[PDB]
Amino acid sequence: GPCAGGAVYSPAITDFTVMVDQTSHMFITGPDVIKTVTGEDVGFEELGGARTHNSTSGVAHHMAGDEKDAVEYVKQLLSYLPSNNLSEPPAFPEEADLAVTDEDAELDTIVPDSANQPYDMHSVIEHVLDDAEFFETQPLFAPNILTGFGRVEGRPVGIVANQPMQFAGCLDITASEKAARFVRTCDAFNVPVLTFVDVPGFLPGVDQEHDGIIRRGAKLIFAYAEATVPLITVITRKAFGGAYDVMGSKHLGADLNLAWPTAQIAVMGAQGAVNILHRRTIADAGDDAEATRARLIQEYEDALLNPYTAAERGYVDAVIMPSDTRRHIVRGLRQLRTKRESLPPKKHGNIPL
């Protein structure tokens, strides 16, 4: 239903907000006031309807088609969380069959040959979760990143993954803030976090800079670095520059970092790299300006655009066959469930706002 004025700030503080399409509205100021003050003529639905707050403002976590479905969604949400921060999330233990199934095998061919051809990360996530069940949150907001809940051996886990089908999986303000809050939510309630990486970098744009991507994008790194719950990261493909660091890297505190053979962990793309490393080499021989750099690019990519340098340094604990991802996550969480870590004493942190 309606939620106007300062009242909106109460739900804003709660962990999750679920709305009903064409039946609920949230707004600090009504259309009438903004109309007489700004001249803008907007209706209630457009101003603060369910869809608006689920895909534009990033304040709502779900839009149900009706109240019954909304209530069902909250019950689902509660089923993944403990009753309070003193207990682990509700579990229904059951030893999984770690034998390579035909489903697990599918992962070995899910990544297309063309580094450009996208794939649905949803499929990857579902292949490692119990009953292939993935409970997504904020589906309509920042589609370039996925957040949600699932279970591994009957134990609730949280998920954060780049979505190649949207913005090529690039990170941006909205995705950073979306994922940041979710990770902190899971951490506060002792929910392990599984992250799947495939990010070419950050979404370029003057608007991104002017809107404060520097302080807002930092929220995600802060979230991961702050987290003391189990953290397992799987890099399926792209992982360049700072994006790599942001996406639950080991440097931030990730406990287990896995990478597929298709993973590409490097400072930057081949072109951007060669144009700098060989700017002077390529400068020479104007004749065949290209093919001489296209070769350098080819050498650089075939030499560094992989996960083996990171593996050499231990940045990734292992380079695994995609089909063994479930096995790794299952055996990883079994050992990590007793993880005991703490941050320096403080009243609280000073995360960028």
Binding site: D108, P112, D113, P261, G314, D317, G332, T338, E341
Partner: protein, 168 residues
Amino acid sequence: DIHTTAGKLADLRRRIEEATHAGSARAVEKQHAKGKLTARERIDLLLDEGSFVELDEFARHRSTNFGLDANRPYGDGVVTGYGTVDGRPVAVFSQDFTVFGGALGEVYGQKIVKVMDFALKTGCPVVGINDSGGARIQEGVASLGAYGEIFRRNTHASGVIPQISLVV
């Protein structure tokens, strides 16, 4: 291929084979002749069937002193990871004598630190299987740094998590 996904998987399989057989055949031969088992055979005896999960399997040293960079074997002379013993969590490292005489190096030492940090973090025992000729002289003081970091971990974990040293 190699530019295709299937080619990258096949590539991984090859590296796996190279990593799991880091030491040369003659080296392994010499080991067995001394009545000693290999680093990996020892781990298989300790851990419960199929529980072993290797870490830093493809780690390699970053030294160029005295032509050391001529040979950069995967694992860098020590096998590490975690598993279960009688169904209970355990962290383990197994020095590989067939690689550089099992001489402790920088990466080699860092791998042991990772397993020790894992054991302390998760609160499980550490089983150390020792079989090293000593410090990898080529790396100079870098090997001493590794030892020191390990000693520090040994002390901090003392009376916190069980530490057993298997000297073979």
